[PDB]
Every structure is written in structure tokens, then in C-alpha cells.
């Protein structure tokens, strides 16, 4: 019940930005650097400078990225299953991690643990200080793993597959402690509440369209709402108890949710391709969205704390 601008305050040209549901190629670091994968290249923008850096190319295709906790290093996955880590200050590739035998669509950090999920059906836990490509392997999906989010505060991982299943794991553990398989479609968009430990948001794809909120560790679906379009990405507000979902078929919007009541506060329009790529600014004020319409849009949605 508060005012929220209906037009982005910045629009960047993002040529070659993928229009593939399973990718999420846009990440805003804790050091305020936006990382974006455009086709075979990765670009960085300093939000403070407006500076643009072009690190790394590949003959392959870039397929996932995730900033390290501290924002000093960027993790990068490829269509051929390769995962690499970049020292952003040095602009050099710090290390080259094997293990996957097919594209790595999603990555997630828990301090020194990097975790990758692939279209082989595997998730891999990797000690990033260690010389080993990986220390634990998890095969609990029967199709592509396309969502992966660490809690860090809670020591909890969520995974979401093209098999419509969601798993929750306690730390680095091989077996999930919980399985939610209600969704009728791919689960790529998921988010943990930073305001309340053990609360997980999950969103379904075309045939499902549902936003569900789970109280993990009590095992209760607190909420379940037909969002009326394919959910492609997701972000929990840091500065407010609100959720932003981004949409595919057949409504290319972002919708801003209240959470207390599970009601839409606002619907943000403009994209002419599915809003596949999404990320929240480090100060929590801004959400950037991206689509195969080759634009990145900056939405001022929240206040200071």
C-alpha cells in the first residue's frame, strides 16, 4: 500500500543475452559489480564508476555465473560442463574445475564451498581452497538441475530440477532432508527469506505457474499461489519482507509480492521476451532484470533500511 515506480530508471543494451529458460546470467556482487554473460563473453560493470570490463571469452557458451561471498571472485559454468573461477581484480582465471559431463546451468556459494548443478543429473560440492575438483557428489534429480540456492546463515541448500522436484539438504550432506515434489513443471526460480530462517520460496514453470512458500524444518507449505504465468526467476527483498518473481509464458513481467498477505503489490512491464535473468542490488534498493530482448532494466523498488 505504498508507491512504486512503473518504469525502469536505467536500461542497458545487452546484445546476445540468452533466451533460454534454464539460464540465469546476471549477478550483482557484494562489491557492487554487475556480472553478465552475453553469448560467449562475460562483462562487468562497476555500479559506482559506470566502468565496463570485458573478461574471458569461450569457444563454447557461458551458461551460469555466481559471485563469491566477498565479491572478489566470479564462478563461471559452460555448456560443456566446465566450471572456472576468475580473480576479478587480477582479471585472470584462478582455476578450472571438471566433474560435469554436460552443461552447468546453476551455481551457488556457501563461503569456501562452491556448488554446481548440471544437465547430467548431478550436483557437486567443491572445496575452493582444496586442489580437488570436488569433494562430494549428489545425484538426486532425474533431470537437469536448474536451481541451486545456499542459505549460508542456515546451513541449508535447495535444489530444483527439470523433474519438477525440489530438495533441501542440511549442509554438505549427500541425502536431502526434505523433498517437495508438488510442482507440475520445472523449478528454477527459488529464494530463501533473509528475514526468517528456514523459509523457502519456489516457483514453477509453464505447466505449473505456482508460487509456493515452504517452512522447511517444520515441513509446512505456508503458501501456494497461482501466479498465472511461467515463473523464470526470483529474488527476496533484503530491505523489506517482499518477493519479486520474473515471468515467462505468457506474461513478460516482474511481479512484486507482499508476503504478509500473499498479494501482488505491483506488476512491472516492458520486456518483450520472457524475463529470465534477475538479481538484487547490494544495497537492496534495485532489482535488475534481463531478457532475450537484449535489455537489462534497473527497477528502483525498495528504500534504505
Amino acid at each position: 500500500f505504498r508507491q512504486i515506480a512503473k518504469v525502469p530508471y536505467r536500461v542497458l543494451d545487452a546484445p546476445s543475452l540468452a533466451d533460454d529458460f534454464y539460464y540465469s546470467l546476471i549477478d550483482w556482487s557484494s562489491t557492487d559489480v554487475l556480472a553478465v554473460a552475453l553469448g560467449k563473453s562475460i562483462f562487468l560493470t562497476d555500479n559506482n564508476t559506470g566502468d565496463v570490463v570485458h573478461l574471458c571469452d569461450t569457444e563454447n557458451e557461458y551458461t551460469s555465473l555466481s559471485w563469491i561471498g566477498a565479491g572478489s571472485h566470479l564462478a563461471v559454468g559452460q555448456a560443456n560442463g566446465l566450471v572456472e573461477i576468475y580473480d576479478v581484480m587480477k582479471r585472470k582465471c584462478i582455476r578450472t574445475l571438471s566433474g560435469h559431463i554436460d552443461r552447468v546451468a546453476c551455481l551457488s556459494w556457501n563461503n569456501h564451498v562452491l556448488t554446481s548443478g548440471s544437465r547430467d543429473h548431478r550436483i557437486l560440492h567443491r572445496d575452493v581452497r582444496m586442489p580437488d575438483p570436488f569433494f562430494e557428489t549428489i545425484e538426486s534429480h532425474t533431470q537437469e538441475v536448474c536451481g541451486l540456492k545456499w542459505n549460508v546463515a542456515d546451513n541449508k541448500l535447495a535444489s530444483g530440477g527439470n523433474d519438477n522436484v525440489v530438495h533441501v539438504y542440511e549442509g554438505t550432506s549427500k541425502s536431502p532432508i526434505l523433498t517437495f515434489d508438488e510442482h507440475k513443471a520445472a523449478v528454477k526460480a527459488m529464494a530463501w527469506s533473509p528475514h526468517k530462517r528456514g523459509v523457502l520460496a519456489t516457483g514453477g514453470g509453464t505447466a505449473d505457474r505456482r508460487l509456493k512458500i515452504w517452512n522447511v524444518n517444520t515441513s509446512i507449505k505456508m503458501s501456494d499461489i497461482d501466479s498465472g504465468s511461467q515463473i523464470c526467476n526470483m529474488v527476496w527483498s533484503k530491505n523489506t519482507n517482499e518477493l519479486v518473481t520474473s515471468h515467462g509464458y505468457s506474461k513478460y513481467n516482474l511481479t512484486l509480492w507482499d508476503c504478509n498477505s500473499m498479494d501482488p503489490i505491483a506488476i512491472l512491464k516492458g520486456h518483450s521476451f520472457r524475463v529470465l535473468h534477475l538479481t538484487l542490488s547490494n544495497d537492496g534498493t534495485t532489482v535488475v532484470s534481463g531478457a532475450g530482448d537484449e535489455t537489462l532494466r534497473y527497477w528502483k523498488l525498495f528504500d534504505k533500511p
Binding site: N80, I85, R95, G99, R129, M130, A186
Partner: protein, 52 residues
């Protein structure tokens, strides 16, 4: 707030090479009439879905 393990140029070349062979080995068979693997990229015109 910790020390990332850093590869020598040689170490990378090993890793890359092994990966490429592991990867090119695992030619797994598929069903070209099954669109699951790519279902979320089919627009409803292509799903052409349920009624009349």
C-alpha cells in the same frame, strides 16, 4: 576472507584435457521425440495444449 586455491598453467592443462576426454566419452542415448529436456522453452503455441 579465505585463500582460494590457485592453479599453475600446467595444472589447468591437465584438468582441461581430462575433462574433455571424460566429456567426449559419455555419449548418452536420447529420445528425439521427447521434449522434457527443453520443455520450459516451448511457448504455448508449440504446446498447442489442451481443449477443444
Amino acid at each position: 576472507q579465505f585463500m582460494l586455491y590457485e592453479e599453475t598453467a600446467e595444472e589447468r592443462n591437465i584438468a582441461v584435457h581430462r575433462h574433455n576426454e571424460i566429456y567426449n566419452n559419455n555419449n548418452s542415448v536420447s529420445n528425439e521425440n521427447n521434449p522434457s529436456q527443453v520443455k520450459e522453452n516451448l511457448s504455448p503455441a508449440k504446446i498447442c495444449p489442451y481443449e477443444r
